[model samples]
Target chain A: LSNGHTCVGCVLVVSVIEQLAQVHNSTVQASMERLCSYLPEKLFLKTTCYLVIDKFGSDIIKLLSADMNADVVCHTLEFCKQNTGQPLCHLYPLPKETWKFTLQKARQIVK
Target chain B: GSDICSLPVLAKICQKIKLAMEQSVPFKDVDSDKYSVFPTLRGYHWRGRDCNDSDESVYPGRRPNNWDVHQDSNCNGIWGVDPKDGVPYEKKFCEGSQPRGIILLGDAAGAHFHISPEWITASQMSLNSFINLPTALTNELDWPQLSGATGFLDSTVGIKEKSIYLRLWKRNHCNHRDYQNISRNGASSRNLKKFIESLSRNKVLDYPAIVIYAMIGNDVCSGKSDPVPAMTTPEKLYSNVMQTLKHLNSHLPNGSHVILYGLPDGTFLWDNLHNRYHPLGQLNKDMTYAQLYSFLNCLQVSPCHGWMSSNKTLRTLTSERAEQLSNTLKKIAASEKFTNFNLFYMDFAFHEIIQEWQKRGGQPWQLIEPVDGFHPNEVALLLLADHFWKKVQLQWPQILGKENPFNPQIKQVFGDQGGH
Candidate 1:
């Protein structure tokens, strides 16, 4: 999608994710899965996925990591850390070592 | 759930998402909640040639037969109808009356985020679309009409009378130049001449006027691509402002008041933006950077991102410049030439109030708009208005008469207890 299309799609997808998250009692993982299934693959990977994670904040990692592909999960964490100039691990108040272990476990799920 | 991926379904979803996103933006949330509590002061509303049918009728300044009267019984006796005309009282009779005319001069803050009627028309957007609120709520609320222009004057009593003239130009600086005429709007020295002439033409020149001049950080800051004289020098600013004040004093009636509001320290804004834990602060920081870059790019100026990178330098320079201007205004106010001009120096009290609110645990986002970190949001404007009214009452007690002109609703929302 063009940049304009990507922006439009990002806005739409984020709104849907937020609405579904609220409707599903903050089951953000199911909301993301639903959103991803509906979006074009390129749009999903390049725009919708990151926008969704950014809007949902750190909660998305804990609630949706079980359902997300390991690569996407790792990418989301790095994206949040770099974009916000703050580490994802620091956002949740967990110890640094525990945060690293959690990331490692998520990466261990190859598929 | 069944094949919701179809093109029609996607379109439907996009529509719903647009509405939802529009509803969730900070502007909508703020306007609906605390911002809409106080209605627009009578006689001041969005007015211009482009006002649509409904806007022409509903907007404050343009609304036909829309006037306000002072409600104090004691003051009313002293300021009854024009003895000569038997009509509503004009400004000449009420020496100690609330400000009968208001003129907003200076930069974007005075223009309410540059959302003036001309701005919306030029941008090809409706006023409602630009601000994102219902016409009633948006028009009735949002705009700031200074205290003197807001309250009832004794003469009008129960009858409404016109009380203000708003002339604001966005991106205006102290040094008068015709740069970006549309964007600069009324910011030029030339427009100042026009503003004065209009007051005379409207026959409100005799009314005690309150002139609010809010040219703060804009005069000192410059884009990375600006020429050798990008930022206005202190010498130039002092001369420009002095000349402007001298001219205004000469033209205004003897009792008119000129309020010289000191610019808030821009450094405070930069600090708020750096606050990582605060959602509104972070968003404001991002938006400020985005707007700065976009404004520069539009001018085809070199993208000087110095404000973001050299935060401390910008803060120091802006604060120092503001102090210098404040001192200059103070000296001018004290001069014998301006003796007839009733001068009130707010001394950056508005900025201090905002900082005090934040110190008292008030959220930064609630006070300022998310679009730009600089301008005050609707809630802040209301608070500022309340603050200004009190200052007027205390400093010029004779002007307020026996009773306060604030309505019950305004007192309920912006009163001492309701301010938080």
Candidate 2:
């Protein structure tokens, strides 16, 4: 299957989604930047981040340094959630510092 | 992975990616000529390739040069004998050394939406009078190529009534599709964050870009009930712009420049044209702008009730609010500095441009488009490009890049794009 079309069962899992939402560290942030050139067009920053963890495969992240700018990713994810009309759509674009603090937590996950 | 798409909204993004192999116009339209080199690619925006954009006259499938003197006016690239040179001309230049691209993150003013009165059907006009906004912005009204900031198709190639993009091209010819008009209708500072975020879609560029942030009039114009309340508060405008600027600061390349435009009062529109008959309504022979704007506001179709409101106080209050927003931009530019891109503040000076248009014997009503009678028309937009270019030329001298020494070579290689 092509990168964008991973699987028929390619549903987003809450655990995966929640883990990505936790604000990744500098290494992960750098990974996001590198993968930017690899992704398809017009998806939001968070969507790309989500893709990295979910469908793009975690193995890819190990070798990446990227600009999937963490805050923008978190910010875009919330909009996708809210705009999508699902239950998770409720919490969006949290307070600015929430991202700053989340980034602190973000580091523990990356490399 | 499960069958249900996590972000159902984003799920299409997958199907969207699957199609990624679909075809590439890779098709970075250098000449802004949307046509594809490969037709089933159905052409560029879907135009034949603009082999050379330096001259507005040349393009693919074009007629031969008026007189072939070594340049390939037609992408056909056939050279007739030159009496002086005794040989065919070959255009040559080191193409890569130019400024990357020019992009306008702006509102409709920069979009150059035009509604010719002649095209307005009485029924379409009547229906649009009621739903004057969404119906009004059919994107059909969008004169994309004639835009003020990122357009090349004004009156002439290098000289007459050129747009900022064209002006840049006249200065240097290598800038191809570097011009983009992402300005939306009725966008305010609040929309800036999303707009800024959208920049990544440009993908990554080989060279840095010159970005123009021109969200004019919308902060003060988009109104519904109370013009006062509909206006974006200076505090909100300040907050949102700062938010967007923060996003932009990190994303932009170091050589980039952002010409941040302040909001325009737009009071001049009502003051001059209120008494005049709208050309569309004029054929009906009885509707003056005073009457038309009142009806638009009455129908709730008016986008800028602050400017279009029948009540003079609404216009004054909106203008005051406009000033407050402009000052917010003023304050930000004075105190803020970004490492990735330089931000420069340019005042909303369309009023001065309008006055100059009046000086040249154009009517004030001429400044307002005949159809919508709200947005600026062809002449107004052409003048805006001229105005902004002049302002930047004198005020921010170094901001405009150097003339492409390759310009003469492009014409020499491409041929005299058959004059103008």
Candidate 3:
């Protein structure tokens, strides 16, 4: 977390909570109450779910209305790609053929 | 559950497997469904169960997507085929289909990713840890006797035979592969020495017709270059090869032959194909001819100092360089007077092959370049093996006696295989 080093982790937690908030939109007010009940338990597990609770608990969900910002999702996607070797999206996943294409693009860019 | 150490060993295994696969040699896999020596193993992480209930924490085994519960051992994240199933180490596990033979060592051979599959490991092995696994799992394998071992010339009518090409591109690179037992550059003057010592330890070289020597390629490559310590210098490299031949001829038992090939003209192919990244190519468009010549001179003296620049067309390779290297090879061949070794030049054959491929409108380079830009592809390697066989057949007819030394088994393994 030094010098905002943990910002990526924090951002990841916020994004996950934002997603949960969207899913419980119909019961927004009640959603926060159920989320708080699970938040502490999730934090004990030290898993990705923990981050979702700490960053976007029931209080934030009850206050906000629309979906999470697109920029935050995009940044989180980049972090996942860099850290976990995951694709930005399942529909447009990076295939083996794209490896050479990416390499060629990098070469051209460098040139 | 086993308190396994996440010491980044998986990446090391991946790197070794990658190299071996590139070299077209047998490698370890999660299972021995194919021709791998070691069966692949199932891998698990800190999770206690073997199979992942959810996608959250499964460390997918050898074949990541194709998950099979049977292949998963120990209910861990990892799954692997048991090493005891390898046929070479245990006859019970050996199916009749697997070829049974020995790996033969050659002169001045060092560590090659391709041949390293047959080498032993340095690490300790437990019931869970993988060691002495087949090519698919690890580098260790059952080694055959050096004497009367199978080679291009030794397989009989009924016997199953296999041989590995023991050419190491760079001797100094062996340390990176964990082949060095002694201090850097202190290993010895040549790989031939180490090879002979190994053979003696196995008590096989002195018997009738053991391993055949394949020397002289390094002599050609290093002729234009300088010494790099433990690495072979052009003159010393040549002398060491010749000395190796002499020692084998005098000491080896009767019927043993050290078949040495003359260095092919590397410059002939090399000069014609200049590496685009050569320092001379770095100059700007405004440079004159005199500046280019001076730059070449600087490069020749101090290649490591980065004194030269790069240009697209400045580094055109020429056939004359090949001729120079070939001449040095011929001189060494003539002076050695080796009975077992056969010397031949490939400048004409290489040139002719390229021209023939060009006439057919086929780019040979596409088929020849391996994943690494420099190494030869399977096609190129087989063609080379065939070329060597043909040369030996024509020049040393008596070496293999009345029977054709170009064994069909060897030919089938070498010829026209698209991939490993």
Candidate 4:
């Protein structure tokens, strides 16, 4: 994706995947931050949780951290995982940075 | 509520809601037993369906499970099927109940804004010193003369000042999984078809004038090798495109236009730029700027460069390659009579100026490329766009003002028109 010629194509594909997943409830995960940030608002129509797909190359793992009720947290996690690898399987999961960030924030919310 | 004339929207909404609810419910609770044989009838009252003896399971790209309907004769490997059983079976839809109009299929050349070394050379030469200029004219030409070079410039020209709705498709490598996925699922063809089908379900298809398509080289360049063969050789792809057009034409309201573009010669462009350095002197080296530019003008190719740096081959393009591409496009347009974009000859008067810069020991890369020694910088793209705009002005300075003899907005949407 970093290569000049390939990056543009990659970005375009990711954009379409994100938009299509929103239009249909059948969700899909994307690699770039530009794509992931729009998920919560698009999917649930509510800002209940922040979801991120930790990637190690093309392997993506769905991680959702919620500052809300446990039901919300559990449902978000389930939905995120269900939709994670469906669309763009090329996105791999790296060491979970977003998950760690969410965990830290979650503690603050609970307190 | 069921009567459309009485409450069409309400009826449609309720029907859609019922379908959605039915689809969402568990299969066990749904009517799966409808096709089961009762055994009391003349023949075992099993589902009155044709069973294929040589059935092979459809792979869903995942491990098969017991519930996986791949083995089911009824499932047909696809997630769903039309329940009706008959010849020319209608799918509970009507023709005139769909939305139609011009559908835009744009290439990523205008959108993918990356730079390369070659672009840098072109821009530096055009922006800074006109080194190669024939001394007298170098100083003689003004800012306007120094700028404005290359071929296959822009898309907005023939389409300007007109209220044309744009439908953007995701850009990806032409043959790769990414490109295939987007093209199959996200392209305007698929979206429009789905839109039409939904409208048919509601019994609604009255749409606008024509559907216009514009795409180019990326279908080839985005791939690992040449895209020209990939495009023309794949009869299925061509058939799919043609069939889609035919389907759209037949299904749309009266007087719909359908246009498809002929692919440009990527091989010509690639052949020209494939060799950047030669054993011979720089002046004697060959380039492919003409071919690339021709594709752009003919709208056969988008204004983006495809770079392949593998197997010790270092390929690069010059602005001259644009002219070659433009010429091929002109030939295609003349022979085929491509009226969609009002295909015209490019006045490479600007190239003449850029060529002067090349003579001054200036590299083509500097003027156009930002990185990877290919692709146009923002300035180069804009200049190309401007060229197209100028072409539009030459043809119809005021298209709307011209009298519409046909006065047939919907009739303009056919493939016979150049809009294809």
Predicted candidate 3 versus true structure: per-residue lDDT over B1-420, tens digit per residue: 342233467667666556543432324423321123222221110001123222322211112222222432111122223354532211121112111111233312211112221111111112222222232123221122111121122322222222222111011111011011111111232654653432321122212232334342332222122322223445765677666656655544444434433333333222332332211112212222223323233223212111122321222221233344445455655555645433333332554445544555656553322211222333333344445445556876444333322224223432321111
Query: Count of backbone clashes for each model?
Result: 6, 31, 37, 72
Candidate 4, residue A66: lDDT: 24
Best by DockQ: 1
| CA lDDT of every candidate | 0.39, 0.55, 0.30, 0.28
Off by over 4 Å in 3: A1-111, B1-192, B199-234, B264-326, B337-349, B352-361, B404-420
* Consecutive 10-residue window with the lowest summed lDDT within model 3 chain B: B169-178
Interface RMSD of every predicted model, in angstroms: 14.7, 23.4, 23.8, 19.1
> Which candidate tops TM-score?
2
For model 2, residues B60-163, the per-residue Cα lDDT tens digits are 33333543355554443434554465643322232334444566777767766665453333323222232323223323245556666755443422336866
Off by over 4 Å in 2: A1-111, B1-97, B121-140, B154-159, B200-205, B416-420
Q: Work out the TM-score per prediction.
A: 0.46, 0.59, 0.36, 0.29
Residue pairs of candidate 1 with colliding backbone atoms? B67-B160, B67-B161, B68-B160, B68-B161, B70-B152, B70-B153
Among all windows of 10 consecutive residues in model 1 chain B, the one with the lowest summed lDDT is B172-181
lDDT score, candidate 1: 0.39
Candidate 4 error regions (>4 Å): A1-111, B1-102, B107-210, B225-231, B234-241, B251-306, B310-389, B396-420
What tens digits encode model 1's per-residue C-alpha lDDT throughout B137-209?
Answer: 3333233332122212132112222222211111111000000101122243323433433222022323344
lDDT of candidate 4 over B1-420, digit per residue (tens)? 445544756666656445532332111112332211221111011111112223322111111223222332222121222334431111111112222222223333322223222211211222122222222121121111111211111332222221122110001000000000001111222233332322110112222333333333343343323323332223333343444445544444443333343333223234434344311112222223332232222222233323333222312332223234444434533544322223223342435324543555544444344222344334443444444444435763431122222223213321121111
DockQ, every prediction: 0.07, 0.01, 0.02, 0.02
Using lDDT as the measure, what is the rank order of every candidate, best first?
Answer: 2, 1, 3, 4
For model 1, the superposed segments whose C-alpha errors exceed 4 Å read A1-111, B1-99, B114-205, B225-229, B277-310, B355-360, B396-420
